[PDB]
Amino acid sequence: AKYTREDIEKLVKEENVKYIRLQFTDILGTIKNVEIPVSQLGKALDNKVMFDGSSIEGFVRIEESDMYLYPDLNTFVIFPWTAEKGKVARFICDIYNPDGTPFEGDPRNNLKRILKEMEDLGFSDFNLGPEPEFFLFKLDEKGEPTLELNDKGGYFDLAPTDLGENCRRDIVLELEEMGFEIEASHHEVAPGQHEIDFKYAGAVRSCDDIQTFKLVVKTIARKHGLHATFMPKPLFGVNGSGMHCNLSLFKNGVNAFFDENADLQLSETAKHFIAGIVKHATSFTAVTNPTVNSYKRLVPGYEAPCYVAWSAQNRSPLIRIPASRGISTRVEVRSVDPAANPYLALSVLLAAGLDGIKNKLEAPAPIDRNIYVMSKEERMENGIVDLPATLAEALEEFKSNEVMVKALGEHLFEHFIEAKEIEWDMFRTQVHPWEREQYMSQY
Amino acid sequence: AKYTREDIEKLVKEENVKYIRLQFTDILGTIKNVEIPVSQLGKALDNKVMFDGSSIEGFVRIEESDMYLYPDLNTFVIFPWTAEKGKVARFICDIYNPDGTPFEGDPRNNLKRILKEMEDLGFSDFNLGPEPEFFLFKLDEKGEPTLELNDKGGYFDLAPTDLGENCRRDIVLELEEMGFEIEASHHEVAPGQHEIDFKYAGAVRSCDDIQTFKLVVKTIARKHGLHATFMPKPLFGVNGSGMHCNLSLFKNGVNAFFDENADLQLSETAKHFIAGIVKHATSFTAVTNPTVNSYKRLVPGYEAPCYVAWSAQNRSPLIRIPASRGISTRVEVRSVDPAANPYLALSVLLAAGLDGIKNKLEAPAPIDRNIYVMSKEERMENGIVDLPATLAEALEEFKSNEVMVKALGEHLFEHFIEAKEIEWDMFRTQVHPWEREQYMSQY
Amino acid sequence: KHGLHATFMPKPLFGVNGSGMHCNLSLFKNGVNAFFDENADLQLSETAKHFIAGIVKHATSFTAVTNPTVNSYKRLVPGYEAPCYVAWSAQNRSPLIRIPASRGISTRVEVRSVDPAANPYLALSVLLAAGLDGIKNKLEAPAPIDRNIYVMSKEERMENGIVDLPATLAEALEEFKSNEVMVKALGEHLFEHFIEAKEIEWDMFRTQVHPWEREQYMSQY
Ligand SMILES: [Mg+2]
Ligand SMILES: [Mg+2]
Ligand SMILES: [Mg+2]
Ligand SMILES: [Mg+2]
Ligand SMILES: [Mg+2]
């Protein structure tokens, strides 16, 4: 435990906290919350604070149902930018049913369940090193989003010189004050695109920071007159944004993926992991790329995964394996994007991985040769399947996979499919300007 | 023969024709042409006029290849609106290879081939009574299309009162002077939507008029400061435009679909026809609804076919059977839209129909009960398949059907698939404003 | 002060959720929640049952007070989690009366028809009146209607103990004028002026010609 209930009570008093937000996540990955005055902390730490848990299902909810809110004192943070008049602190919580049992529809819960499957397999911890990317746009007069990019930097360039702005720097500084240990940041390929990578951390913790990260990024960015977005592909023709996930399984406190003696220094356990993700990849894409626009990023020519395959060095493998070895040995899934629900994304990935480990699934041969120059036919002969091209396709596949479906839970699954299904329908029944610019006069 | 070569030469001289357009259609249904001075008529009637036939493949062409142009004197027409300075006449032609043989890539040819399959089956003629719908929009200052509709009329209302405009009336009048025998016209369901129905006519002739019709509509409409469009679904939320096709097979000069003694007065031949279209419907949709936007019209709630089924009276059956019987006995396919290539659409329909007749395919039971209130599950139990939801799906199905594929010709098929395939890719890799209005801020 | 404008208007925007001011009620006898009952169906004492009966009886009658404005009824429309029919449940799309999960001294009856435009004191007067009317007369509470009312035909909906709330301010006012206890719940002087205020108010709204009317009739006719 990082914070005992006394440590908190003393922290709220000393730091003069005046506002406490009890945040959590819904099925769509959206960051939700229920704010209480500092004079409510007591009932909060007592887990007696209630709320309409049907809000977890998002815009699919049908009837309100009372649910409890159990704060996790380890996630206690104090937002530094808020000050004077009143300091604001948060508390990521766990949703609990009125009777006292965990709500099966809560994503953060689903992750723990899958993580419990991992421990029952002999594994200690499951780390995650995310690489969330995002774009920053300018705000107009009314303070609305615009297609105007904040800068014109390239991949790894000295983005926004150290002026009074440099939103990317400022975010990293704010995160550091909040206790966020960041690895490094840099300007991304496309103009106005940025990236900040964290140090590895346990599953639930890493996902907790991904949620808090987006919040901080969007917040600080709005203070700088900018608008931050984790939309997979905002602008056509330019690079999209992904949130690559470096995973590593630990056993007895040792990277179970490292095998110095083995070729590429990758142990049998690690190779089976790969097989797992390779077998379920096309099936968990609906989760790791939950939006319609997510698939506008999954197109060739922008360094984003399009076919299921892995290597050490390639134009853009679905699964990449970093150079560093030893305790850093890890497998990187590059298909995931920042729009994905961090908790639901790990749940599915871990399940795909743990699947191969248990069933000793055999991993295919790496693909180091350029795969983007091969035809769909030539791709088959080599056993290279393609990822789903649309949310619709990703949904049919996801429903075909028994393990991936069980990786979310009957409740969560049911709602996820319902929401996305409606999402797609709206999109498909819609008539976009492109269709008019292309057919209005031609026909 | 309607016009002997002498009749033409005398008509061009007497009517002082100064400009002759040798029109034809490409694979995309687009109306193409090659205009010649009246002083070129000779070489024209001699079928010695050449052109780059690779233009028939549309934006897919790769290398130019000389091809001949054989005018059909029966299609000779004189556009009435053009006058004074110089009168203009047209001549729908047939594309012929340099050696003298018909080009397999010409749609109008494909239709004759399929029609030859019909005659070799004992049938005399194959009629077609189209019902093309279209919208008229206003032109701005620069004379560009706008989303502003010409009127606000409803279904069968007294559209645009008899003023100096009334574009719908004026088109019908112009067509009548050109020798177009129209059945009737009326204002359609959606505002600014119009419909004009012709009298039945042979396959090639009816398709010839559908091509000429669009030309006349778009032309006259532009004279009235309006902009005509046969785009399947211009505006979201409002009705789309279809081009229902009333078909009827003739044998020895008698409607082979009529059987007074038989129930519903429909002969065995007619019922087998239905079976044919019901079996290939999901497969020929890629042809009858060739554009991406075509599927934005194939959505429920706008009186447009969404499931394969037929009846005498329903909310919107794929196949409808008009009341009138006897020589008028006919089957109406309501899935087809005006964006479809008239020639390629008949080719496929006729093949689907002739398929059932030859193989004596058994027709399913009519569906008179409301089908739009049933679930996808409840739909299955009743054996009601759904039409393709996107151009992508329609293409995979079309390629699965051996008969439908052979209904177009190896050459035409190959090019059609290539073009549409590219069409879809552009559309899918595109990032529409809708996606941004929905994700930009949410993520 | 924030360059903004707060509004408690029941329904300021069409096709968007309206604002309601749900009222969680709870009666105490001798400093003890008279609505809680350890060993009882759904852990709800008789007094609580009777209170629910009293509200269900005068629900259609006190609507005029809890929804005093004309706009208050553009909120009372299906599809926006706002009460549209008289019924009490614990888990439903949008019941008029709801009984939250928690029990003990937290046992309460929630009335969701009330909106923020209502006069707090007057709203409580009729609500409490109706609730006491049920306890004093030990009115029998109807069966809790779970299921889903927002899909039942109107006939069917009526075949069961389910009536829809007043459609307009006028409809509500007439009903209110026929309910003796509801009338005696405000007071001769309050009731008088209230009815006057709303009738004069409603009349203004009924004689007005809205843009919607011209958009729909100016050309079609
Ligand atoms: Mg990157
Ligand atoms: Mg990376
Ligand atoms: Mg019509
Ligand atoms: Mg019709
Ligand atoms: Mg409430």
Contact predicate A281/A352, CB 8 Å:
yes
Shortest CB distance from B428 goes to which of A339, A389, A443? A389
Shortest CB distance from A235 goes to which of B145, B234, B431? B431
Q: How many CB atoms lie within 10 A of CB A24?
A: 27
Q: How many CB atoms lie within 10 A of CB C91?
A: 16
Residues B118 and B192 in one domain: yes
- Angle between helix axes B203-223 and B342-358 (nearest 10 degrees) is 150
CATH number of the domain encompassing residue B115: 3.30.590.10
Residues A159 and A97 in one domain: no
**C93 assigned ligand-binding residue:** yes
Residue B295 with chain A: CB contacts under 8 Å: 428
Task: Tell me the β-bridge partners of B193.
Answer: B135
> Residue holding tokens 């009526």?
C158
B243 C-alpha to ligand 3 centroid (Å): 7
Residues A114 and A98 in one domain: no
Residues A92 and A232 in one domain: no
**C147 assigned ligand-binding residue:** no
CATH number of the domain encompassing residue B3: 3.10.20.70
Torsion of CA C141, C147, C153, C159, to 10 degrees: -30
A26 C-alpha to ligand 2 centroid (Å): 27
**d(CA A110, nearest CA chain B) in Å:** 22
Residue A251: burial class (beta carbons within 10 Å; 0-12, 13-18, 19+): middle
**d(CA A127, nearest CA chain B) in Å:** 24
Q: Do C101 and A64 touch (CB under 8 A)?
A: no
Scanning every residue of chain A, which has its alpha carbon at the shortest distance from the alpha carbon of C101? A66
Residue B398, SS3 per DSSP: helix
Quote helix, strand, coil % in chain A, to nearest 5. Answer: 40, 20, 40
Residue C81 with chain A: CB contacts under 8 Å: 64
**A435, A438, A442: best to mutate for the B interface, most B CBs within 10 A:** A435
Scanning every residue of chain A, which has its alpha carbon at the shortest distance from the alpha carbon of C93? A63
Residues B137 and B39 in one domain: no
Residue C112 with chain A: CB contacts under 8 Å: none
Domain end, chosen from A106, A136, A169, is at: A106
Residues A145 and A78 in one domain: no
**B326 assigned ligand-binding residue:** no
Buried b / exposed e across A96-126, counting CB within 10 Å, b at 16+? bbbeeebbebbbbbbbbbbbebbeeeebebb
Q: Do A443 and B236 touch (CB under 8 A)?
A: no
Residues A352 and A220 in one domain: yes
Give Rg (Cα) of chain A: 22
Q: State the first-to-last Cα distance of chain A, in angstroms, to the nearest integer.
A: 67
Contact predicate A342/A201, CB 8 Å:
no
Angle at A324 between CA A319 and CA A329, to 5 degrees: 60
**A431, A436, A441: best to mutate for the B interface, most B CBs within 10 A:** A431
Residues A224 and A368 in one domain: yes
Q: Do A66 and C101 touch (CB under 8 A)?
A: yes
Pairing mode, strands A254-255 and A243-251: antiparallel
**B133 assigned ligand-binding residue:** yes
Structurally, chain B folds into a number of domains equal to 2
- Angle between helix axes B107-119 and B342-358 (nearest 10 degrees) is 20
Residue A49 with chain C: CB contacts under 8 Å: none
Contact predicate A111/A203, CB 8 Å:
yes
**DSSP string computed for B218-229:** HHHHHHTTEEEE
Residues A82 and A155 in one domain: no
Beta-carbon contacts of residue A71 (< 8 Å; ≥ 6 apart): A22, A44, A45, A47, A91, A92, A93
Domain end, chosen from B106, B126, B151, is at: B106
Residues B188 and B287 in one domain: yes
**d(CA B440, nearest CA chain A) in Å:** 6
In one-letter notation, the amino acid at residue C77 is V
Residues A3 and A152 in one domain: no
Residue A430 with chain B: CB contacts under 8 Å: 236, 296, 432, 434
Beta-carbon contacts of residue A167 (< 8 Å; ≥ 6 apart): A136, A150, A160, A194, A220, A221, A224, A226, A228
Contact predicate C10/C75, CB 8 Å:
yes
Shortest CB distance from A63 goes to which of C93, C100, C101? C93
Pairing mode, strands A193-198 and A126-139: antiparallel
Instruction: Give, in order, the Cα–Cα distances in Å from B240 to each of A429, B133, B232, B243, C13.
Output: 12, 9, 5, 10, 30
DSSP A49: -
Active site positions of A, annotated: 52, 131, 133, 188, 195, 244, 315, 332, 334
Residue A227 with chain B: CB contacts under 8 Å: 441
Residue B62: burial class (beta carbons within 10 Å; 0-12, 13-18, 19+): exposed
- How far is residue A243's CA from residue B136's CA, in Å, rounded to a whole number? 47
**d(CA A223, nearest CA chain B) in Å:** 15
Domain extent at residue B142: 107-443
- Angle between helix axes A342-358 and A268-288 (nearest 10 degrees) is 140
Identify the helix (H) or strand (E) that includes residue B128: strand B126-139
Beta-carbon contacts of residue A32 (< 8 Å; ≥ 6 apart): A23, A24, A25, A26, A55, A56
Instruction: Give, in order, the Cα–Cα distances in Å from A126 to each of A93, A211, A279.
Output: 21, 18, 20
Enter the tokens of residue B222: 């532009």
Domain end, chosen from A85, A106, A127, is at: A106
- How far is residue B145's CA from residue B40's CA, in Å, rounded to a whole number? 36
Shortest CB distance from A433 goes to which of B296, B428, B433? B433
Q: How many CB atoms lie within 10 A of CB A360?
A: 10
Per the document, the length of chain B is: 443
Q: Do B229 and A434 touch (CB under 8 A)?
A: no
- How far is residue A15's CA from residue A45's CA, in Å, rounded to a whole number? 17
Question: C interface toward A at CB cutoff 8 Å?
Answer: 81, 91-93, 100-102
> Experimentally, how was this structure solved?
X-ray
Instruction: Give, in order, the Cα–Cα distances in Å from A317 to each of A154, A247, A343, A371.
Output: 22, 15, 23, 9
> Residue holding tokens 């054996």?
B383
Q: How many CB atoms lie within 10 A of CB C201?
A: 15
- How far is residue B62's CA from residue C35's CA, in Å, rounded to a whole number? 83
Scanning every residue of chain B, which has its alpha carbon at the shortest distance from the alpha carbon of A424? B435
Shortest CB distance from C101 goes to which of A62, A63, A98? A98
Environment of ion ligand 2 (residues, CB < 5 A): A 244
Residues B326 and B421 in one domain: yes
Active site positions of B, annotated: 52, 131, 133, 188, 195, 244, 315, 332, 334
List subunits contacting chain A, requiring 3 or more Cβ pairs under 8 Å: B, C
Contact predicate C118/C127, CB 8 Å:
no
